Amino acid sequence: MSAENEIEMRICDYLRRHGRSTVQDIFKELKLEKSTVNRHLYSLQASKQVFKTVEDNKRPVWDLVE
């Protein structure tokens, strides 16, 4: 269990429990670094596991593809 897979799996599971979330909610409830979470969000987006939604006067939120 790669520690980078552990962070992505912890992240996916955060989104399962709470639904689409900002990078802020995520890194602070997983007690992780914002730059850590951001890294693995784009990694997970690349491997098509999470996806990002943007909106006017709103923060981007991530949720699970599947």
PDB file of C-alpha atoms in Angstrom:
ATOM      1  CA  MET A   1       0.000   0.000   0.000  1.00  0.00           C
ATOM      2  CA  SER A   2       1.895   2.990  -1.383  1.00  0.00           C
ATOM      3  CA  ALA A   3       1.586   6.081   0.865  1.00  0.00           C
ATOM      4  CA  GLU A   4       0.507   8.051  -2.203  1.00  0.00           C
ATOM      5  CA  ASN A   5      -2.256   5.507  -2.754  1.00  0.00           C
ATOM      6  CA  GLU A   6      -3.134   5.821   0.872  1.00  0.00           C
ATOM      7  CA  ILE A   7      -3.619   9.531   0.520  1.00  0.00           C
ATOM      8  CA  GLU A   8      -5.716   9.147  -2.610  1.00  0.00           C
ATOM      9  CA  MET A   9      -7.800   6.399  -0.956  1.00  0.00           C
ATOM     10  CA  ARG A  10      -8.264   8.526   2.163  1.00  0.00           C
ATOM     11  CA  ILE A  11      -9.278  11.381  -0.135  1.00  0.00           C
ATOM     12  CA  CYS A  12     -11.778   9.363  -2.163  1.00  0.00           C
ATOM     13  CA  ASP A  13     -13.263   8.125   1.069  1.00  0.00           C
ATOM     14  CA  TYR A  14     -13.606  11.653   2.378  1.00  0.00           C
ATOM     15  CA  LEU A  15     -15.627  12.508  -0.723  1.00  0.00           C
ATOM     16  CA  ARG A  16     -17.770   9.346  -0.252  1.00  0.00           C
ATOM     17  CA  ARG A  17     -18.627  10.385   3.251  1.00  0.00           C
ATOM     18  CA  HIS A  18     -19.295  14.055   2.520  1.00  0.00           C
ATOM     19  CA  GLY A  19     -20.035  14.511  -1.175  1.00  0.00           C
ATOM     20  CA  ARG A  20     -18.500  17.155  -3.401  1.00  0.00           C
ATOM     21  CA  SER A  21     -16.114  19.244  -1.348  1.00  0.00           C
ATOM     22  CA  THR A  22     -13.603  22.066  -1.752  1.00  0.00           C
ATOM     23  CA  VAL A  23      -9.850  21.477  -1.412  1.00  0.00           C
ATOM     24  CA  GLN A  24     -10.156  23.392   1.841  1.00  0.00           C
ATOM     25  CA  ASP A  25     -12.688  21.053   3.508  1.00  0.00           C
ATOM     26  CA  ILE A  26     -10.686  18.059   2.404  1.00  0.00           C
ATOM     27  CA  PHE A  27      -7.191  18.930   3.576  1.00  0.00           C
ATOM     28  CA  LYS A  28      -8.401  20.188   6.975  1.00  0.00           C
ATOM     29  CA  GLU A  29     -10.555  17.190   7.896  1.00  0.00           C
ATOM     30  CA  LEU A  30      -7.972  14.725   6.697  1.00  0.00           C
ATOM     31  CA  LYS A  31      -5.460  16.821   8.629  1.00  0.00           C
ATOM     32  CA  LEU A  32      -3.286  16.973   5.523  1.00  0.00           C
ATOM     33  CA  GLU A  33      -1.279  19.653   3.689  1.00  0.00           C
ATOM     34  CA  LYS A  34      -3.251  21.720   1.148  1.00  0.00           C
ATOM     35  CA  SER A  35      -0.394  21.192  -1.328  1.00  0.00           C
ATOM     36  CA  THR A  36      -0.526  17.470  -0.568  1.00  0.00           C
ATOM     37  CA  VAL A  37      -4.255  17.239  -1.270  1.00  0.00           C
ATOM     38  CA  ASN A  38      -3.995  19.375  -4.377  1.00  0.00           C
ATOM     39  CA  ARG A  39      -1.289  17.168  -5.816  1.00  0.00           C
ATOM     40  CA  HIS A  40      -3.339  13.990  -5.469  1.00  0.00           C
ATOM     41  CA  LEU A  41      -6.577  15.590  -6.634  1.00  0.00           C
ATOM     42  CA  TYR A  42      -5.051  16.275 -10.036  1.00  0.00           C
ATOM     43  CA  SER A  43      -3.471  12.803 -10.019  1.00  0.00           C
ATOM     44  CA  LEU A  44      -6.896  11.265  -9.317  1.00  0.00           C
ATOM     45  CA  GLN A  45      -8.499  13.493 -11.936  1.00  0.00           C
ATOM     46  CA  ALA A  46      -5.933  12.283 -14.421  1.00  0.00           C
ATOM     47  CA  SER A  47      -6.726   8.649 -13.689  1.00  0.00           C
ATOM     48  CA  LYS A  48     -10.404   9.618 -13.990  1.00  0.00           C
ATOM     49  CA  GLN A  49     -11.429   8.974 -10.372  1.00  0.00           C
ATOM     50  CA  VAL A  50     -12.467  12.430  -9.157  1.00  0.00           C
ATOM     51  CA  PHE A  51     -13.697  15.406 -11.189  1.00  0.00           C
ATOM     52  CA  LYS A  52     -13.833  19.159 -10.654  1.00  0.00           C
ATOM     53  CA  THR A  53     -16.854  21.433 -10.927  1.00  0.00           C
ATOM     54  CA  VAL A  54     -16.505  25.206 -11.268  1.00  0.00           C
ATOM     55  CA  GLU A  55     -19.155  27.835 -10.725  1.00  0.00           C
ATOM     56  CA  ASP A  56     -19.504  31.623 -10.675  1.00  0.00           C
ATOM     57  CA  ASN A  57     -18.814  33.243  -7.276  1.00  0.00           C
ATOM     58  CA  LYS A  58     -18.093  29.795  -5.885  1.00  0.00           C
ATOM     59  CA  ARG A  59     -15.135  27.593  -4.960  1.00  0.00           C
ATOM     60  CA  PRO A  60     -14.313  24.614  -7.171  1.00  0.00           C
ATOM     61  CA  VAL A  61     -15.596  21.364  -5.652  1.00  0.00           C
ATOM     62  CA  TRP A  62     -14.401  17.816  -6.304  1.00  0.00           C
ATOM     63  CA  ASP A  63     -16.539  14.663  -6.425  1.00  0.00           C
ATOM     64  CA  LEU A  64     -16.216  11.011  -7.482  1.00  0.00           C
ATOM     65  CA  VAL A  65     -16.521  10.013 -11.098  1.00  0.00           C
ATOM     66  CA  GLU A  66     -17.914   6.521 -10.416  1.00  0.00           C
TER      67      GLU A  66
END
